[PDB]
Design a binder for this molecule. Sequence first.
Ligand code: PLP
Ligand code: PLP
Lengths: 365, 365
Amino acid sequence: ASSSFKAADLQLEMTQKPHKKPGPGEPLVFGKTFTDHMLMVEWNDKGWGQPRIQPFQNLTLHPASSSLHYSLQLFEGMKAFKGKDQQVRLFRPWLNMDRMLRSAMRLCLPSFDKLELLECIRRLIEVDKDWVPDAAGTSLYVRPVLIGNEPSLGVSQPRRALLFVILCPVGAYFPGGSVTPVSLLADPAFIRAWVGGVGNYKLGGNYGPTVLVQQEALKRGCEQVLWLYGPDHQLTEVGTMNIFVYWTHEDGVLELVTPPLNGVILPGVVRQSLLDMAQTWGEFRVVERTITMKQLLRALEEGRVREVFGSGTACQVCPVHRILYKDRNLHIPTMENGPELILRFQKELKEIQYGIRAHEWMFPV
Amino acid sequence: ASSSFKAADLQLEMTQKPHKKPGPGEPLVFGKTFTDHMLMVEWNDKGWGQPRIQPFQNLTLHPASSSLHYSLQLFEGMKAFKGKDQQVRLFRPWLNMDRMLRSAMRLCLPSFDKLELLECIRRLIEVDKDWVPDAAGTSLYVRPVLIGNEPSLGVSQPRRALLFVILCPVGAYFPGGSVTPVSLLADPAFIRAWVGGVGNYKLGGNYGPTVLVQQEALKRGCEQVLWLYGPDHQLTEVGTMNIFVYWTHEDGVLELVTPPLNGVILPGVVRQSLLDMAQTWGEFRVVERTITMKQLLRALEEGRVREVFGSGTACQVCPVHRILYKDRNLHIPTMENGPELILRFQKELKEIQYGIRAHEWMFPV
Ligand SMILES: *Cc1c(COP(=O)(O)O)cnc(C)c1O
Ligand SMILES: *Cc1c(COP(=O)(O)O)cnc(C)c1O
């Protein structure tokens, strides 16, 4: 009664202007197409209003809105998948709710009950169940967002906020049983986040500044940015992805490594999962630890590196075959080693996500 | 870039819903009250549209707007002052245009011609001329904003943007001829910007994360945050203000020092001006150098510190009498030394800003 909105009070408003779905020919470029409905909940000094599913529509915002002046905004990104039996499922939606909540706190935005939001999302996706593609490799992208909405140029804790969710079908990222590597630009010139910063939260502010760097990565001939940090150029993340390395370490032990959640990297859901899986298999050392370019160069020379890749909801797993550093093109042997591990990861997630094998990680819609 | 919009094509829609000025006894709380009109220019596939002054109104934005997901937003803050002859004037508006433009480039937003925007702003202020307060110490706050407006969840260079300006009368911050100090929280726990970061640009993303820390500063019993950086806790800025110190250095020379424009600092307009003035007077060493808490502690005990303060458009100059560091309350002698330096700076700016003495820094409206 001044804490959280409840799914039980959700309000439905089916559209009166259904939109033509992307014909079976239609491309489906990442975030360019949206479904018919959206979720919407308002918050002010009266607590949350009633959550409501409404037709997709513009946002009406006051010119002084803090979401626009002081970046009082955060968002989440997760996927729902439709299996061959056309049942739709989310991938560990809970971890996303957690993260959203944590970001919400960092920006002094109002908290809410994750189960209620999750259910509300489940109701929304349900409403647009038809928008979920089901061609192999495709999915529905779930975009929850929360922004401060005070019509005040004061940089204070907002007293008015707004949470909303939008959905878009996304097409396949790789052919059924393979993957294609990407080249990375690695330049100390740019930092993405720092210690004591806010990079371990998914806030809009973390991304705005990457657009320029991303272009520099392309003009320089690469496709993504490997973010280096500190004086030893430690690897943090690869653009909107957590970085992983499968190699024989200096101590001669075969292991899967990924930078620790110090506070400069984002707690990827896929990231978590890949560790979970690997720790399960028990076939090799799985460790969270700092990785430095130094260690990487030497591991490359002595040929101890097998696979390098990033994790993320866009493709789950993505191979790396080239890293441009100090104007030096480093060939990464990922494809030459299978990529054995990447494919397994890829294969296991697909069977879990598309409902080939039942699993606790999947939240049915 | 595209060919800037031109003032000559400015389109004017006068309001039919004049809000009525704040009663002559109504608290001009910063960023709370807005005037009747706003400026608005759109940008897209076809370069800039026509700039237009229109009635203050909400912004209609697509749910996927990049200004809301990846913080593709920046803004500027400057003041216009009305003299007793009712002539309105801006304070070095050019430096603001420059800065705006630089921020615009860092986020890959479209460029525009500084002079055209300035004229457009001059036209808008002209239109709301009556909204500029006359009380000594008051002013009109000018808030230009530029945001990416791509209805796309893709984190790319926008192809659709929007620039707009809103205005609000602000009341006095100090009574005439005096000032009141503020206490600062100085904790290495929090970092505002980093080297190679984007703190030297006025981007919304820089601020969102300060709201929490600001509350912690009040909770700790302070009023503003002194941002410390690096391993030696070098002073960077004091919240939305540049920090200045008037002290005898370790070499025995009396000087006014302020952190250099190394990139972790915002190029304040007031900051620039205070240096210009001091440089002019030629009465003491004026320098841009790194300042470390170490140096400050030692100056305090040896008594070499006279005045400490920050610069910013909100109050021009603001005294500091206390800095809480390591749970240690440091008394700063600012008020005990006049504060002579601060008073002079405050006197000079007032006479320039309110048109008591003509000056090249003032841009008439
Ligand atoms: C999206 C993203 C990740 C990965 O998160 P997932 O939950 O796996 O989608 C990691 N780092 C950054 C900077 C990201 O944007
Ligand atoms: C507003 C601000 C300043 C001061 O700039 P002015 O142009 O003099 O107002 C300095 N640093 C930060 C972080 C600011 O927000």
